[PDB]
Symmetry: C3
Subunit: 138 residues, 3 copies
């Protein structure tokens, strides 16, 4: 069985969209997908971040291009990255993991995380799950 | 035959150079190389971007170090990233793909893309092509 | 024979920490680990950069969150990324490589590199070592 594992390190919207798109497409294709949220990505899956009214953060390197993208996505009614992940779970085999080390660094507790997080694990556990499939660091 | 596949997400010069160097080095070593330009990387392979007279953009995180690099490369007459890719295509087995989803988000049409793009494809296509080789997200 | 290879392109502290954490965890789990420092990551392993008194650089995209992280790490007495890598070498099979191309671009000589660098090699040499294992670009 085909497998895709992604270490979701980044927390800007322009990087979270690819995560959602890859996850959704891979799940639809019948892949096993493993997501490992760490550092800024882990911050992005906290309930506080997900419910924030503040406008999503685009990478400062491409600020000038931000509105074009945001405007064209809302125009297409394109789902948000987290909705893509949750829908993928319903359609295929998708597991969402939170990095335990980052949680200590940012003082994040399990209860602070989105309901769709399946487990809190360390690095080695993710390496073992990623073994043999395609693996990306985003 | 060894294979390298790269998702070229970034569009800053400091990230596009590695793409060129990896492609060139791998192709010369006998690797099959697949490049998938998406988001900012897709912007970078539009004819408009390639022909722009505006100075390449370094990652804002390393601005202070930008000139040192730019100066030392023009001093060595080091080829531009896209020249390295095109030369790699002539030397080895290199395929350049453009992401169809990003093209919709940024209103880019096939005619707007550089001639060296072989095809416009979606995510699953690139997963399929990458399967079994080394795969990187840049 | 489980193996992890990482192309360490980035030079900000928030990206170097994951490199140390991945290396340390992988080595402790019995993985062979290969690190290839290139571009800004290569700069980060020069003796000058390692001995610098200047405060580590966080990604400008997450400046606001920098102090929280630094403060919580020094509070836990969390080792620095390079200490995690050197400790991993002592514990397991970890090899550190420097990118020969970027060394020309930045005018870095072998003597300028940290003693823990095992060899200076080109990109195809490192791809050959990475083949068959999990490979990441950070
Ligand atoms: Cl990667």
């Amino acid at each position: 069985k085909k497998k895709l594992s992604i270490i979701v390190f980044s927390g800007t919207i322009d990087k979270l969209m690819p995560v959602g798109i890859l996850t959704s497409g891979a799940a639809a294709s019948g892949y096993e997908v493993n997501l490992f949220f760490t550092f800024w990505g882990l911050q992005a899956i906290t309930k506080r971040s997900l419910n924030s009214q503040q406008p999503p953060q685009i990478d400062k390197n491409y600020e000038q291009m931000g509105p074009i993208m945001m405007q064209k996505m809302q125009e297409m009614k394109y789902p948000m990255w987290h909705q893509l992940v949750q829908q993928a779970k319903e359609i295929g085999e998708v597991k969402v993991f939170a990095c335990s080390t980052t949680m200590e660094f940012f003082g994040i507790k399990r209860e602070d995380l989105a309901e769709f997080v399946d487990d809190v694990v360390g690095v080695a556990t993710f390496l073992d799950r990623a073994e043999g499939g395609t693996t990306l660091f985003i």
